[PDB]
């Protein structure tokens, strides 16, 4: 499929208890590769993916400094948002941003984004043209005027179109042995008496990467979409993902039902029965 590099910043104030907490996490596709956590006596940008050993030795020091400077401006944004929204100094509040770029499998850029949130709600976002801002309310409109006057969209667009894709391309190369080899799911079906006349068929898919997957129940080859229960995809803990799909069937009718598993790592869809 396509590829993306995604970063997420979170800033949380704590009145009475000192300085705000600041977390960065970065992802290539469904793999976390760095983190920064200000909760430490000397916080560092740190690797979270083994193929990050291949960076230049000055990388960690450089990224640690940029991270500390970013924390400082998010500390100031938490106080600024208090003034825009006319809130007291008493309560804890949250400021978040997320941004990233996307790339076709051949490495070509096609999408970049940048958004900001305050207390869990849209605050301001870069528009699809990467040349203008959308403010979510009148408080955020202060930030819209300020950032238009100072030409911030261009600097944001420059980063998302050049540096972001350039480095997404390098990281994919660094971790090709793992980021570009899909791990197919291991699928099985289980049987558990639901009612006196009915049974639950559960179709399990474990140990797959990346996270995108199709798990559907068919009865006599037709889609059973209304009557399936389907859990949100969840992490295995080892960098793999899991999902399952269930359906309730009349007893003895099991053979009517089939489970289809489409995943990037499967040459052809798996088809399973009880």
């Amino acid at each position: 499929g396509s590829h993306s590099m995604r970063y997420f910043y979170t800033s949380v104030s704590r009145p009475g208890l000192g300085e705000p907490r600041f977390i960065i996490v970065g992802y290539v596709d469904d793999t976390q590769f760095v983190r920064f956590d200000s909760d430490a006596a000397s916080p560092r940008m740190e690797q979270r993916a083994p193929w990050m050993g291949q960076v230049e030795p000055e990388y960690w020091d450089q990224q640690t400094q940029i991270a500390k400077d970013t924390a400082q401006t998010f500390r100031v944004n938490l106080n600024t948002a208090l003034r825009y929204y006319n809130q007291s100094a008493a309560g804890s509040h949250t400021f978040q941003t997320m941004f990233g770029c996307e790339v076709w499998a051949d490495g070509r850029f096609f999408h970049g984004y940048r958004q900001y949130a305050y207390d869990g709600a849209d605050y301001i976002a870069l528009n699809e043209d990467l040349r203008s801002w959308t403010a979510a309310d009148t408080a955020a409109q202060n930030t819209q005027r300020k950032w238009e006057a100072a030409g911030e969209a261009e600097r944001h667009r420059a980063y998302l179109e050049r540096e972001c894709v350039e480095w997404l391309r390098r990281y994919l190369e660094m971790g090709k042995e793992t980021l570009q080899r899909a791990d197919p799911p291991k699928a099985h079906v289980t049987h558990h008496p639901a009612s006196d006349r009915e049974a639950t068929l559960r179709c399990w898919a474990l140990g797959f990467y990346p996270a995108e997957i199709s798990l559907t129940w068919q009865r006599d080859g037709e889609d059973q979409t209304q009557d399936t229960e389907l859990v949100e995809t969840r992490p295995g803990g080892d960098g793999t993902f899991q999902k399952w799909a269930a359906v309730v069937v009349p007893s003895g009718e099991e053979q009517r039902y089939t489970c289809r598993v489409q995943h990037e790592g499967l040459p052809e869809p798996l088809t399973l029965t009880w």
Binding site: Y7, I24, G26, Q63, I66, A67, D69, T70, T73, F74, V76, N77, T80, A81, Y84, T97, Y116, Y123, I124, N142, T143, K146, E152, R155, H156, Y159, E163, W167
Partner: peptide, 9 residues
């Protein structure tokens, strides 16, 4: 890789 954009709101 991150850069510093000084994102003061």
């Amino acid at each position: 890789t991150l850069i510093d954009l000084t994102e003061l709101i």
